[PDB]
Design a binder for this molecule. Structure first.
Ligand SMILES: Nc1ncnc2c1ncn2[C@@H]1O[C@H](COP(=O)(O)OP(=O)(O)O)[C@@H](O)[C@H]1O
Ligand SMILES: Nc1ncnc2c1ncn2[C@@H]1O[C@H](COP(=O)(O)OP(=O)(O)O)[C@@H](O)[C@H]1O
Lengths: 74, 524, 136
């Protein structure tokens, strides 16, 4: 419904197409469903942008998302 | 009519096209058409051919020159010259004011007054000093350019200045497939036969393509295959795969018999070539040979790695030398082993190595000590087969490991692995291998190996070392430890030989080929 | 070449060595050097049989391009890896035309063999005998 609402031109221009939390047990399909969506949109699983939050265990890991402040390395 | 300075320092491509000497350009019709439509623009009509080195970027400009001569271009281009301007000595006086801009403006005004030049500028990124001279002429439309650069150079230089992006349009040039490279070679065949006066078989073409794709990673098709077939037909009635393999042996140093052996005969002889390098560990060698045969039988998903093995045994008793034997046998060199450094995973709080060497054994030294981020990378390699692209399907993954009774007082390690690692990851290793604590006779056969590797090495100094088996036998004590064995022996061979002979012949005597016959004195 | 040991496919090739000092020697004005270069390149194009040797090649693409364009100047040269890493690798128009040949560091044995050959004319210059074992 979100994908169709986007391509139909009804999506609010200022907001992303959709944002979803997939909550459930381990090994139930909720990463595979994202992979299948990416495949259906781009023909390949590899076009997904995958962020592994387990490495972001510290607050300063946030620099990997948005960069290092002026004067800091990288 | 004429452009006297430009004609001195630019290779005229369209005249070489009319002179028939230019080689054919095959299959690049999409890229040529994209260049045509970019050139027809009114404003930013300057294509940049973006692609890896050697993929055919200049061949697009030469195909354009052919299209112009062959009247295939639209009428807007029917008469334009294509001039490959070389930067090499457009810089010539790096200190003086204006000496660069002098001859640059001279070339540019010649190109202006002869308003029918298309200029090809290879390594365009090297211009970004000149940009302030080109921007006004480009804006004025007098000069029309084809650039060529790598993608990373483009991002590093041209993308950063919006005023350059406001003048140049990117055209992606990709490395052709094996099929396209074959079609290229089959076109160029006749033109190379006319030079070498040798027949070139189709099987030699496909062999050259395959072997350039499998033994020369750091270079790209078609240039690899062209270079290979050219140097082979130089080395040579007709060309054949044996000459291709000989040239690959030249470029790699790999022995020719290792190169031209089939997959099957390679993996059949495998475990003998393992046994003779490692000594002992019969169960481990049989396990790894069984597992790799099972993988290469070809039923497994061809995107997944060839193997994934955990080594449990004590210390250094044979793990690393078995990994090096596996890399030597499966892929052709000890240099086919990559030792991963775990610091890369800590550093955020390998990929560019695999890019260079995809036929390699990947060794994880003591995976227990790694950052637990390593398991994300491991799982990603072991399930998808690719990272960022870099592809692991040809690699073998080896992960090494080393996993008091307060009282009056061969299966435990299989237990303790389960709880010492993430079991969801142990669900995905292909096999688990246990190394035994080696026997004394195996250890002294190692000593016969190392003493031979010293004797023949010393023999390069004309020092014909000779040794008595019983003397080596009675150094088998000199490093037998419950913790380790294949290491302390290395601190025995130099004391028992090198320093022993440093007392016995190097001083107070003199080195001669006779008493370097080590006779057993009854003790050592 | 002079032994005619080279392939029968190129016995006619003549090897010659170009020194910039000689080419500038006695030039009296600017551009005379460059035009003497251009006319010797034209003579090279007419002859077709030449092969040109250029030591200290790193002293050199464009000014000799008119005969590197198609490769009318068949070229052989020597350089150190230092004076190769920094320049000859760093011009695509050279990497399109040159091929590096590494000349190996020789063994002790080969160096004493070449010595005990070439020794005979240094004996001549000194009028002294060289012990072959003192060489080794
Ligand atoms: N409902 C399902 N349909 C199809 N395949 C599934 C389903 N649930 C799990 N799987 C399979 O098992 C794996 C499930 O991974 P997944 O459950 O997406 O990881 P997680 O949910 O723990 O992030 C995938 O390889 C997928 O093929
Ligand atoms: N379509 C093609 N037809 C014939 N030869 C080609 C083709 N594409 C590339 N080549 C060959 O590849 C070699 C390298 O050319 P190129 O990749 O343009 O060099 P560069 O690294 O400057 O881009 C040349 O010898 C060229 O003839």
């Amino acid at each position: 419904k979100a994908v169709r609402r986007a391509r139909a031109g009804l999506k609010d221009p200022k907001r992303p197409i959709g944002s979803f939390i997939f909550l459930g047990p381990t090994g139930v399909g909720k990463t595979e469903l994202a992979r299948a969506l990416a495949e259906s949109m781009f023909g390949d699983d590899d076009a997904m942008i995958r962020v592994d939050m387990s490495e972001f265990m510290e607050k300063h890991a946030v620099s990997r998302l948005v960069g290092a402040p002026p004067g800091y390395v990288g | 009519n004429n452009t006297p300075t430009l004609d001195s320092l630019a290779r005229d491509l369209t005249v070489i096209a009319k002179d028939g000497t230019l080689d054919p350009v095959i299959g690049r019709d999409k890229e040529i058409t994209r260049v045509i439509e970019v050139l027809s623009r009114r404003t930013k009509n300057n294509p940049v051919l973006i692609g890896e080195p050697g993929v055919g970027k200049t061949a697009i400009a030469e195909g354009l020159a052919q299209a112009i001569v062959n009247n295939e271009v639209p009428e807007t281009l029917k008469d334009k010259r294509v001039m490959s301007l070389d930067m090499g000595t457009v810089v010539a006086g790096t200190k003086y004011r204006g000496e660069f801009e002098e001859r640059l403006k001279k070339v540019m005004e010649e190109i202006q007054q002869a308003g029918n030049v298309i200029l090809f500028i290879d390594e365009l990124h090297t211009l970004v000093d000149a940009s302030n001279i080109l921007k006004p002429a480009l804006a004025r439309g007098e000069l029309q350019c084809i650039g060529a650069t790598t993608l990373d150079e483009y991002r590093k230089n041209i993308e950063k200045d919006a005023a350059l992006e406001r003048r140049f349009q990117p055209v992606q040039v990709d490395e052709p497939s094996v099929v396209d490279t074959v079609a290229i070679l089959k076109g160029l065949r006749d033109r190379y036969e006319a030079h070498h006066r040798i027949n070139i078989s189709d099987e030699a073409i496909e062999a050259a393509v395959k072997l350039s794709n499998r033994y020369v990673s750091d270079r790209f098709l078609p240039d690899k295959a062209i270079d290979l077939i050219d140097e082979a037909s130089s080395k040579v009635t007709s060309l054949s795969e044996e000459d291709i393999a000989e040239v690959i042996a030249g470029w790699t140093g790999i022995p020719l018999t290792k190169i031209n052996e089939t997959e099957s005969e390679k993996l059949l002889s495998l475990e003998d070539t393992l046994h003779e390098r490692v000594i002992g560990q019969k169960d481990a060698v049989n396990s790894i040979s069984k597992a790799v045969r099972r993988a290469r039988a070809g039923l497994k998903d061809p995107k997944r790695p060839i193997g994934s093995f955990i080594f449990l045994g004590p210390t250094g008793v044979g793990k690393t030398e078995l990994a090096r034997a596996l890399a030597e046998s499966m892929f052709g060199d000890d240099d086919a082993m990559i030792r991963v450094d775990m610091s890369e995973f800590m550093e955020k709080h390998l990929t560019e190595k695999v890019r260079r060497k995809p036929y390699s054994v990947i060794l994880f030294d003591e995976i227990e000590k790694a950052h637990p981020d390593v398991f994300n990378i491991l799982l990603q390699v072991l399930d998808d087969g690719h990272l960022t692209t870099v592809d692991f399907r040809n690699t073998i993954i080896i992960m090494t490991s080393n996993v008091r009774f307060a009282g009056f007082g061969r299966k435990t390690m299989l237990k303790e692995l389960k709880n010492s690692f993430r079991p969801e990851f142990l669900n995905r290793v292909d096999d688990i291998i246990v190394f035994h604590k080696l026997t004394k006779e195996e250890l002294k056969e190692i000593v016969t190996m190392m003493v031979n590797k010293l004797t023949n090495r010393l023999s390069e100094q004309n020092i014909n070392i000779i040794v008595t088996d019983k003397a080596k036998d009675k150094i088998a004590e000199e490093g037998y430890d419950p913790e380790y064995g294949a290491r302390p022996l290395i601190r025995a061979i130099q004391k028992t030989i090198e320093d022993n002979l440093s007392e016995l012949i190097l001083d107070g005597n003199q080195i001669e080929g006779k008493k370097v016959t080590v006779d057993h004195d009854g003790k050592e």
